[PDB]
Design an enzyme around this catalytic site. Structure first.
Site, PDB file in Angstrom:
ATOM      1  N   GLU A 220      -0.854  -1.298 -10.763  1.00  0.00           N
ATOM      2  CA  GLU A 220      -1.043  -0.100  -9.918  1.00  0.00           C
ATOM      3  C   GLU A 220      -0.124   1.033 -10.309  1.00  0.00           C
ATOM      4  O   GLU A 220       1.072   0.838 -10.554  1.00  0.00           O
ATOM      5  CB  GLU A 220      -0.802  -0.402  -8.431  1.00  0.00           C
ATOM      6  CG  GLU A 220      -2.022  -0.818  -7.641  1.00  0.00           C
ATOM      7  CD  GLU A 220      -1.706  -1.106  -6.175  1.00  0.00           C
ATOM      8  OE1 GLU A 220      -1.128  -0.262  -5.499  1.00  0.00           O
ATOM      9  OE2 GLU A 220      -2.058  -2.172  -5.680  1.00  0.00           O
TER      10      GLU A 220
HETATM   11  O1  PGI Z   1      -0.494   3.649  -1.412  1.00  0.00           O
HETATM   12  C1  PGI Z   1      -1.452   3.484  -2.440  1.00  0.00           C
HETATM   13  C2  PGI Z   1      -1.622   2.014  -2.754  1.00  0.00           C
HETATM   14  C3  PGI Z   1      -2.473   1.267  -1.720  1.00  0.00           C
HETATM   15  O2  PGI Z   1      -3.731   1.930  -1.537  1.00  0.00           O
HETATM   16  C4  PGI Z   1      -2.633  -0.217  -2.167  1.00  0.00           C
HETATM   17  O3  PGI Z   1      -3.521  -1.004  -1.335  1.00  0.00           O
HETATM   18  C5  PGI Z   1      -1.277  -0.909  -2.217  1.00  0.00           C
HETATM   19  O4  PGI Z   1      -1.365  -1.966  -3.167  1.00  0.00           O
HETATM   20  C6  PGI Z   1      -0.165   0.039  -2.562  1.00  0.00           C
HETATM   21  N1  PGI Z   1       1.140  -0.252  -2.670  1.00  0.00           N
HETATM   22  C7  PGI Z   1       1.842   0.868  -2.969  1.00  0.00           C
HETATM   23  C8  PGI Z   1       3.375   0.991  -3.159  1.00  0.00           C
HETATM   24  C9  PGI Z   1       4.113   0.663  -1.848  1.00  0.00           C
HETATM   25  C10 PGI Z   1       5.628   0.444  -1.924  1.00  0.00           C
HETATM   26  C11 PGI Z   1       6.337   0.345  -0.717  1.00  0.00           C
HETATM   27  C12 PGI Z   1       7.721   0.148  -0.706  1.00  0.00           C
HETATM   28  C13 PGI Z   1       8.400   0.044  -1.927  1.00  0.00           C
HETATM   29  C14 PGI Z   1       7.706   0.138  -3.141  1.00  0.00           C
HETATM   30  C15 PGI Z   1       6.326   0.337  -3.142  1.00  0.00           C
HETATM   31  C16 PGI Z   1       0.905   1.885  -3.033  1.00  0.00           C
HETATM   32  N2  PGI Z   1      -0.301   1.345  -2.799  1.00  0.00           N
END
Ligand code: PGI
Length: 489
Positions: A387
């Protein structure tokens, strides 16, 4: 030019709950998340947006359109998940003399008989539809990473409102070893039904976020939104053994690679006196978890042990990456700083003068080289960038964001790290969890009224990267920061 190995693949990642619903027929009311985002109290509290996933992009019905565009874009890899709740919507009878008071789950015996038994509980319309989806996927030349889990649980395994309320007598999600047990069996089952279509496996997507936002970061509106340090640790301990058990479960029906997808930020020092703080932040957010599932090293009770049932349960590492976290030293330890990374103002500028996304996340492609190389130096397991993307409906920053991070992947491979793909989040706009539809991550824009997909100029830029297997000379200037002066401050 920045040329990638001939075997390196460019594509995208997608989630079931976020992308499937939207076309009549696709509705899955059977998850904690579905219930959670429909909850009257959660809506009034502002914990959830009020947007509902059943008005989503409709990948369930329109997957052929998705795949057509992906193929036109020159994409050669795709990672998504099956939704558990679609396959097993109804409660399974409790495991025969499995002891639900036991803290460790060191094995879950699965065989052809146990698998045929589950088979009689499985929703067959759902399985056939997934087979249809994954077949069309494969026919487009897409290498296929199948993920078992991307956040929602069957409601029969987790009633999130009950737990939010402080009642622990019901189905309690990752707090219950029953969930651990059923998860190992669900994974083995899916691998057993779909191995012929699948190339590599992931057990889970960002378990750290599930346990961290579910039980600590409660303003994020993630289920069950029960504020407890202790229970967050319990959820995380259970998810770790659920990984290991899912791994063993799949490996009993497949020789294909089994990995995990995890949330990463690049930890960066506020001042040059903050580098121990960076290491402590990496221990606390990254290494503790991976040292468990790779090296078997876990701290249970107040003691450092090696669990033999945990050790060696990983073939590859899914690197999710969006931005950095700036940390400083504290006498008591370390703290993350607001005004940087994910804690910025939306459509503005960080404390470092770097632009922030529609979500308030700071532009920091360096961090991806940091995270890729740190993993490689520690474990020497190959990786995919599972991602990477930006909330950006206008498409102002995504061209720069895309090329800059792809460049850091090239950088990383140049340094010796084994990275085998880059998968953008996401192909098309989708339901951003508690935020609803307003956070738009797609290379393709979704008109939600008609379900029509449009090519943002970034999609055209990515097509250049993907069909050429390279950042071409003509788009190479986009390996830079979006100019802030024309943007909102
Ligand atoms: O926010 C965009 C995407 C989501 O749509 C996905 O379902 C999900 O896998 C996802 N994760 C993250 C990063 C979140 C994160 C939180 C705290 C620390 C590091 C990374 C961003 N996203």
């Amino acid at each position: 030019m920045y040329s990638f190995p001939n075997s390196f693949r460019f594509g995208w990642s997608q989630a079931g709950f976020q992308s499937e619903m939207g076309t009549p027929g696709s509705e899955d009311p059977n998850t904690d998340w579905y219930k959670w985002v429909h909850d009257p109290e959660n809506m009034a509290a502002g914990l959830v947006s009020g947007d509902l996933p059943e008005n989503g992009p409709g990948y369930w019905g329109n997957y052929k359109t998705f795949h057509d565009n992906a193929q036109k874009m020159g994409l050669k890899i795709a990672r998504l998940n099956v939704e558990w709740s679609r396959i097993f919507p109804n409660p399974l009878p409790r495991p025969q003399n499995f002891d639900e008071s036991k803290q460790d789950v060191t094995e879950v015996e699965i065989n052809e008989n146990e698998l045929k038994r589950l088979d009689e509980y499985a929703n067959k319309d759902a399985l056939n539809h997934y087979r249809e989806i994954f077949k069309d996927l494969k026919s487009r030349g897409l290498y296929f990473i199948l993920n078992m889990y991307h956040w929602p649980l069957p409601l029969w395994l987790h009633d999130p409102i009950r737990v939010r309320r402080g009642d622990f007598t019901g189905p309690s999600g990752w707090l219950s070893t029953r969930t651990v047990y059923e998860f190992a069996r669900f994974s083995a089952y899916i691998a057993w039904k779909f191995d012929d279509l699948v190339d590599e496996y992931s057990t889970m997507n960002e378990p750290n976020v599930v346990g961290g936002l579910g039980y600590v970061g409660v303003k994020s509106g993630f289920p069950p939104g029960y504020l407890s340090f202790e229970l967050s640790r319990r959820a995380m301990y259970n998810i770790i053994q659920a990984h290991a058990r899912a791994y063993d479960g799949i490996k009993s029906v497949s020789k294909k690679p089994v990995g995990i997808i995890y949330a990463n930020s690049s930890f960066q020092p506020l001042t040059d006196k903050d580098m121990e703080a960076v290491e402590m932040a990496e221990n606390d957010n990254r290494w503790w978890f991976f040292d468990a599932i790779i090296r078997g090293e876990i701290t249970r009770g107040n003691e450092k042990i090696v669990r033999d049932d945990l050790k060696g349960r990983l073939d590859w590492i899914g690197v999710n990456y969006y931005t950095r976290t700036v940390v400083k030293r504290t006498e008591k330890g370390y703290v993350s700083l607001g005004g940087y990374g994910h804690g910025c103002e939306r459509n503005s500028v960080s404390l470092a003068g770097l632009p922030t996304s529609d979500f308030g996340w700071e532009f920091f492609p360096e961090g991806l080289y940091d995270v890729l190389t740190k993993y490689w130096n520690r474990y020497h397991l190959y990786m995919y960038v599972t991602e990477n993307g930006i909330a950006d409906d206008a498409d102002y920053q995504r061209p720069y964001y895309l090329v800059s991070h792809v460049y850091q992947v090239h950088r990383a491979i140049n340094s010796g790290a084994d990275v085998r793909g880059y998968l953008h989040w996401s192909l098309a706009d989708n339901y951003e969890w508690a935020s609803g539809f307003s956070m738009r991550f797609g290379l393709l824009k979704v008109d939600y009224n008609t379900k029509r997909l449009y090519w943002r100029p970034s999609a055209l830029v990515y097509r250049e990267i993907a069909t050429n297997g390279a950042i071409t000379d003509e788009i190479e200037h986009l390996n830079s920061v979006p100019p802030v002066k024309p943007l909102r401050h």
